[PDB]
Amino acid sequence: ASYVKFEVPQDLADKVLEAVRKAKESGKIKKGTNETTKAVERGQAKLVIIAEDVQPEEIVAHLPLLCDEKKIPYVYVSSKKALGEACGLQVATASAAILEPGEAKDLVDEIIKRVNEIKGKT
């Protein structure tokens, strides 16, 4: 897919889905592309999670561009059904956002730092 900027290994993808679940429980998340958008536009989001199997690709294509302007890190997962079902929904979701990590702070900080390494940085 073309709106996917970099490569996420499955270990990281699983650590992301975990991070989201703990954030439902102990913090505050936003679920769905529109709500994720508003979370970036408002600067509330600490981490943005985008699914790789969105079916018209362009639905989430604006997020990489938007997150870079607001300097909010974003990450990919492979299944939208899996992200939504993480999110506490019984339906799929195309993108989500973590606003407050709560009991996942340590878990998120490792993610936002692994995606830095496999992006360039130091």
């Binding site: 290994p9 499955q10 270990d11 993808a13 699983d14 079916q55 492979s78 939208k80 059904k81």
Partner: protein, 365 residues
């Protein structure tokens, strides 16, 4: 308890007799065949369980009886299904067929009247039943579930015996033979696990090999694996797995890595590989069959030294998403449940020749 059936080279696959039987149901998720008069049982997302007579290899599967569940059955110990049935297994004694799915219930029905004789809940709000496998020549049932647990049962006690722990994702598929043991696959944990029930121990086999690393060690002279989805046991010492990168792997209990790998076994179609959505090794033989949604059932032969397998042939009348494969004998008859959707709801773009029903192939010698 090892491989002794060598009929791989004898099989008249190119001249196989092929048929398809439509069903009025949506999305068969599993098929289970009984072998001593031979029977098949099918389950669907539409909540229908159906029984077929398949003993006459000359004619297509003959529908005998059906039972449909529904909203009426919302509680979970009611004697009916109310959410997607994901799996079905016929008891080796001919007396029972047991179903399970998203409504977190095992329901055991009599084969006689197709009526529920016992309902056994998993008692967990996440314990969806994903796969069933009877120990061969036994009433001992193994159910792999979505809460990362494998539950065991004694079917003529209609009771739960115990719970097995180890997986770190849903246990998608489970396979068993005559020994009191089973193989499971954990999907995104990218492990296969061999459970020795009486020894209270378990072996762990790991996939998920980085392609850059694989290429790096290949230069000593491909496709990312994100999920190991299917599994089948060939004997008491070997098994096969199938992944969502098209890999079919042969494993020995003695080795940590796969002893052999056929990559993108069902081809591709920038590049996307066909997942392995079905895998059935006929017990103690050197042949196994694989299925995807690529339009054909691939039949493979294992080496006599068990260090490799090779393509015997293709059954090309098998369009659609193969959700389950079974093999019965009298002459081999391959039965396969074909749906428009993946069993579990994984999303599949353009399935060519998408359809609902039962594929049959009769192969001689």
């Amino acid at each position: 308890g090892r491989v002794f059936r060598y009929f791989g080279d004898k099989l008249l696959i190119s001249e196989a007799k092929q048929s398809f039987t439509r069903v009025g149901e949506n999305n068969l998720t599993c098929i289970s065949c009984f072998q001593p008069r031979l029977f098949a049982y099918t389950v669907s997302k539409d909540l229908q369980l159906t029984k077929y007579d398949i003993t006459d290899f000359s004619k297509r599967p003959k529908k005998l009886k059906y039972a449909k569940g529904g909203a009426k059955y919302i509680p979970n110990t009611t004697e009916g299904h109310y959410d997607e049935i994901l799996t079905v297994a016929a008891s080796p004694d001919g007396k029972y067929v047991v179903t399970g799915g998203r409504d977190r219930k095992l329901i055991v029905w009599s084969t006689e009247s197709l009526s529920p004789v016992k309902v056994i809940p998993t008692k967990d709000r996440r314990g969806e039943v994903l796969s069933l496998a009877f120990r061969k020549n036994s009433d001992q049932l193994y159910a792999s579930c979505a809460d990362f647990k494998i539950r065991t049962y004694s079917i003529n006690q209609f009771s739960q015996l115990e719970i097995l722990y180890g997986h770190h994702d849903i246990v998608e598929d489970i396979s068993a033979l005559a020994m009191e043991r089973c193989v499971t696959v954990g999907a995104r944990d990218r492990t296969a696990m061999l459970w020795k029930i009486p020894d209270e121990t378990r072996l762990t086999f790991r996939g998920g090999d980085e392609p850059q690393k694989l290429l790096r060690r290949w230069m000593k002279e491909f496709f990312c694996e994100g999920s190991i989805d299917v599994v089948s046991m060939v004997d008491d010492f070997h098994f096969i797995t199938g992944s969502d990168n098209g890999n079919i792997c042969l494993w020995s209990l003695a080795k940590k890595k796969p002893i052999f790998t056929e990559r993108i076994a069902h081809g591709i179609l920038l590049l996307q590989p066909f997942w392995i959505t079905s895998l059935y090794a006929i017990p103690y033989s050197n042949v196994f069959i694989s299925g995807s949604w690529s339009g054909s059932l691939k039949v493979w032969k294992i080496s006599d030294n068990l260090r490799s397998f090779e393509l015997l042939g293709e059954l090309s009348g098998a369009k659609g998403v193969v959700t389950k494969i079974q093999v019965v004998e009298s002459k081999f008859r391959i039965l396969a449940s074909i749906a428009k959707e993946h069993r579990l709801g994984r999303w599949i773009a353009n399935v060519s020749g998408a359809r609902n029903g039962i594929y049959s192939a009769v192969i001689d010698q």
